[PDB]
């Protein structure tokens, strides 16, 4: 609960530890926050892409690539870039050019998916989207070894909501 | 064909109030259309062509 | 006429096939199945609790006579948590649990008539609930109704004096006035994300973990109904009506046991 | 013995069934799986695979004396083509969330013009089938026709896995009768509660096997008959590619 | 009540001897379980045609020859061959093809008929489907002496149904 | 896709851009504004004082369930004033106003 | 505007709802916040 | 930073490469893996798996300060992706007899504006590889340039095996210099004896990288630089399915 808008990447890919692993449930506490989350939480059912966008806030002098997986549910969540490689996924390589757009697939047996979950969903939900190091943020002499990417996320032009409801009340604090 | 309903008068309420919606889809997938609405942030001068040009480096 | 039923399909005949006959036939449209269900029949009594009008809401029964109740014709309830939310079930609770006991009234709640004669394994129909409170004296009766698979927990009272189930912006129904005529009515759309629902059985799990429990699927009933009212002692029966019905895939109906007694049956 | 219009061929990939008594193929519903893509995913599928498009042949059980009617074997699908024998649909299924497919069936049993006796095949979708999908290891009546209850539910009227085996000839079916035929040939279109299914959780068909009227003989006649099948998903079509399974078991 | 679905054919012909004997109502016991019973259940009338299927399922080489009737009400269900062949009947040959189609033709004073009973209906109801055996099962030295003859029912192309109703409720067990 | 997200305008994409996909829209309408709040939500309990209907108005609230009410859906009310005029309000009030108090059911009015 | 109200039973409380008929809304802004939960990795309901 | 007419994806199922600093992509040969039929084979193949047609990515190895001239790591085709991490292809692949396809790979590797160094990537046909046919596990400098000769041919000038690496670049290649490229990307069509290949005793394309110009840099610059590649079959056709492999090593 000490959020903050970014994950940090480092100067060493271990293969067997992800940089981030987010549940693709419109749910995840991960989202809680995003009006994506806080507009879907007002609906029963939604459909289409959901877009995670990170943006690299490290030196123009680093240098690195990523391996940025969604793997549907199924077989449990990947527990090594090797295993997320199997699945659906992209590699990001940094250069002049700031961030990258990754759309998971919408992929489901029934064309409406539940918004919220009623009790926790398991080893469930929709599946995830694991980001890896492929290659180690790399660097000069003089420049920090590490940078923040920013995450953040949005809807596809694909994406539908449909029956309004209301969520169960809260208080913010 | 119909069930149990038999009145005269056209339905106060329409039908897409008085039942569901019955929609289709196709096997291929469907274009969303381009834009959802009219609201927008807009990107000016994002190019160029025009300024105190060609001093410019090369 | 000879045939072959080893094929899986036999040819129709009338009288006209082997004798010297005439066909009879005389149109009727009273067997089309949108016909058929077009009409109301009850899946049990429910009750209020007292004060529900100006608290929160909490799971309660009254005599095994609840609170809530899901919007699907199988069975539900689940006697032994009279006081628990209540559940979908796959089996029918007798009236008593112990041989000398009965199985008349059932406890559980269902649309009885539609379990005994259900010939299809898939269908997709719209709900239209009524309400019939048991007395002809003044009521007071609150609905909320949440479609199915959204918050179905109406627990935090949010305003002061206002039931908990009266709040936000969920479907909320509310009748209560000396000129009423006490019953609600209302028809509900089709709000499973399933293209068809599972009629009698559902041959697969809850989770990937197959967690083995099969039965139902997920998300395919018509939603909740949570009660609040001012007669806590009235009782008052749901009644289920399918509007426009549709059903998929003939399949066998409940069993009737042999009269092991004539030649034919009867009533009761 | 058997003949003409009688006598048929089905050719799957390098795979190809014959037999020289059949009664025709019972499509159910009338229809056949289309190998359309599922419009619930974004995902292209992986569809067409040759080696995935052919019968699958194993033995089920064998028919005896002792059968009494309506004592069926159960063979809950995609599931049981899910292992080792499944080949490469076993293989491509386990690494894939989820299968759209229809199914094409042969069951076979022999005898002789001095045998009498004749089985019912069906084929239903969501029929109650074990917990883990598997096929019915032994011939049983378990649970017919008012479905598994609890223990403790002594009055109540029955569970919602009743089969009232009076009328299992609602579902597409065939019989296989010793003085009529040796083979019975059964397809079926896809049909679920969704546009494809996480078969995963979900054996939404069963091809059953049912006594219908009792295995009869003179001595000397063959004494029990083995029952054996041919399987062959029908353009199945594949989405939502993962890493494997694995404990497939 | 430990019913089978068939009847057995015997090597005797004992023309005092149905092998089946079904009264032609919806009620009959007989018919509790099929389809067209369960469906019958549920409307006050009916009218039409009613079919008897039945599948050979003996061995190749038996033989045989049935009597298949029909007697509407008046005289009473008959009771031997003899008066049965006197009504509405069909012969049906053992050969080749395995089963045989007889349809009850709707013989009745009034235009539809009432599904179920109210009390138990005697004597009456609508008559009776006889089998009998014309001619014994015949066979060769090496082949079992009976045989299993399925029964089935169903509505015929001229079967009708009116009236939606509910049947008294039962409990299977 | 490789995007420039410091624009402050992000190019919108479907499963189409990277992959081998198809787009999968599907129209609906209950996203319009308007169908979204054209439904009822209340904003509290009030309440009447005795024989107001044959003498002067007087503010007053029964259990904090007052006489009047604005017209709003921002908060209201200020519970330490329930027999004063109700006003709008900047902030919520809890239920109780120590540690050990509870924040529901809410005090002022308000949608 | 204000409603002032006057009645018969001073004992019964009423509720008082709101319908927005016809909504316009004009430049979108953030909601409110929603607590981190410091349990899972979802919510749920209440 | 990376930029512009180098900036390039390479879409290939559920899978896509992305670089900022390309130099293209050499088709060694000048031509493509068509995907045709071998004509050799009289059955029909399984081609066109969606499944199969994408991006393998894993681990090389490590590039050092260390590594001498020449020094290389040798990756034998189609067998490194034959395994758990060949997915959908290696389970295919298991289950025929044989195979016929190109390869399409992508090597990675970055480091900094202030380190000097360069790698020499190459495909070759009928390169020799290890017995086994697997991923060298460290860089050597093993059996250059006269190739391996038994222990007592004292004399023997040299052996069949021989690589004369002066001369490596021959092979389609692409070097990946740090001050240039981050990324080198190749293709090659199919080449072979035959028509078609039993790869089971076959590695016929070897993936090498081989270092040219040692790693130097100053301190504080990075210090070990990971090399890893993307590898994807170009349009694999497979004929003779039987059951599997199954000893996959």
């Excluded at chain 3, 899946?43 to 609790?49: D, E, S, Y």
């Excluded at chain 4, 499509?27 to 599928?45: I, L, M, R």
Aim: proline share 8%.
């Amino acid at each position: 609960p000490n959020a903050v808008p970014y994950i940090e990447a480092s100067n060493t890919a271990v293969k067997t530890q992800p940089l981030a692993v987010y549940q693709v449930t419109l749910s995840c506490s991960c989202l809680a926050n995003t009006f994506l989350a806080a507009l879907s939480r007002n609906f029963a059912q939604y459909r289409g892409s959901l877009v995670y966008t990170f943006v690299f806030t490290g030196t123009a002098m680093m240098k690195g690539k990523f391996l940025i997986a969604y793997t549907p549910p199924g077989a449990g969540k990947p527990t090594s870039r090797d295993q997320a490689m199997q699945a659906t996924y992209a590699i990001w390589d940094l250069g002049l050019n700031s961030s990258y757009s990754f759309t998971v697939p919408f992929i489901s047996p029934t064309h409406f998916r539940m918004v919220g979950t009623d009790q926790a969903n398991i080893t469930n939900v929709d599946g995830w989207v694991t980001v890896w190091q492929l290659t180690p943020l790399t660097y000069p002499p003089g420049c920090p070894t590490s940078a923040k990417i920013l995450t953040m996320v949005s809807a596809g032009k694909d994406f539908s909501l449909k029956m309004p409801i209301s969520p169960a009340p809260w208080s913010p604090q | 064909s119909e069930g149990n309903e038999g009145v005269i008068i056209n339905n106060f309420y329409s039908n897409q109030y008085q039942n569901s919606i019955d929609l289709s889809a196709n096997a291929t997938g469907s274009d969303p259309p381009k834009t959802y609405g009219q609201f927008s942030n807009l990107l000016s001068g994002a190019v160029n062509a025009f300024s105190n040009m060609l001093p410019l480096l090369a | 006429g000879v045939e072959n039923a080893e094929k899986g399909v036999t040819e129709n005949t009338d009288a006209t096939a082997d004798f010297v006959a005439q066909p009879v036939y005389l149109p009727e449209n009273q067997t089309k199945v949108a016909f058929f269900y077009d009409r109301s029949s009850p899946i049990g009594a429910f009750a209020v609790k007292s004060g529900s009008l100006e608290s929160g809401f909490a799971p309660f029964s009254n005599k095994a006579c609840p609170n809530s109740v899901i919007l699907t014709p199988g069975p539900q309830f689940d006697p032994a948590y009279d006081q628990l939310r209540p559940q979908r079930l796959t089996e029918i609770w007798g009236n008593g649990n112990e041989e000398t006991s009965e199985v008349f009234p059932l406890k559980t709640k269902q649309d009885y008539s539609f379990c005994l004669f259900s010939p299809f394994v898939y269908y997709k129909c719209d709900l239209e609930v009524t309400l019939s409170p048991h007395t002809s004296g003044a009521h007071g009766l609150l609905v909320r109704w949440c479609p199915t698979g959204t918050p179905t927990k109406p627990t935090t009272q949010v305003l002061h004096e206002v039931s908990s189930l009266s709040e936000g912006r969920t479907p909320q129904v509310y009748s209560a006035g000396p000129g009423t005529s006490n019953q609600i009515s209302f028809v509900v759309p089709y709000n499973s994300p399933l293209s068809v629902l599972p009629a009698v059985w559902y041959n697969g799990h809850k989770r990937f973990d197959n967690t083995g429990d099969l039965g139902i699927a997920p998300n395919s009933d018509f939603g909740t109904l949570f009660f609040a009212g001012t007669k806590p002692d009235i009782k008052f029966t749901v009644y289920l009506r399918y509007k426009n019905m549709r059903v998929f895939c003939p399949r066998p109906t409940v069993f009737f046991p042999w009269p092991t007694s004539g030649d034919k049956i009867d009533m009761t | 013995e058997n003949l003409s219009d009688r006598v048929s061929q089905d050719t799957a990939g390098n795979t190809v069934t014959n037999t020289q008594s059949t009664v025709g193929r019972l499509v159910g519903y009338g229809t056949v799986h289309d190998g359309e893509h599922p419009a619930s995913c974004a995902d292209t599928a992986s569809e067409k695979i040759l080696a995935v498009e052919r019968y699958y042949t194993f033995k089920v059980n064998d028919w005896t004396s002792t059968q009494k009617p309506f004592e069926y074997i159960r063979i809950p699908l995609p599931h049981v083509l899910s292992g080792e024998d499944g080949g490469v649909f076993g293989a491509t299924l386990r690494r894939h969330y989820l299968v759209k497919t229809g199914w094409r069936v042969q069951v076979q049993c022999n005898a002789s013009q001095f045998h009498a006796g004749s089985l019912l095949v069906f084929m239903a979708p969501e029929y109650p089938t074990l917990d883990v999908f598997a096929m019915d290891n032994r011939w049983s009546k378990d649970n017919l026709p008012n479905g598994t209850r609890t223990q403790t539910n002594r009055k109540g009227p029955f569970a919602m896995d009743h089969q009232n085996f009076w009328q299992w000839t609602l579902y597409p079916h065939q019989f296989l009768n010793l003085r009529t035929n040796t083979t019975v040939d059964l397809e079926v279109p896809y049909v679920n509660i969704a546009p494809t299914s996480s078969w995963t959780q979900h054996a939404s068909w069963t091809l059953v096997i049912a006594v219908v009227a009792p295995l009869t003989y003179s001595t000397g006649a063959s004494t029990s008959l083995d029952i054996t099948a041919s399987i062959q998903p029908v353009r199945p079509v594949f989405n939502g590619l993962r890493h494997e399974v694995l404990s497939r078991q």
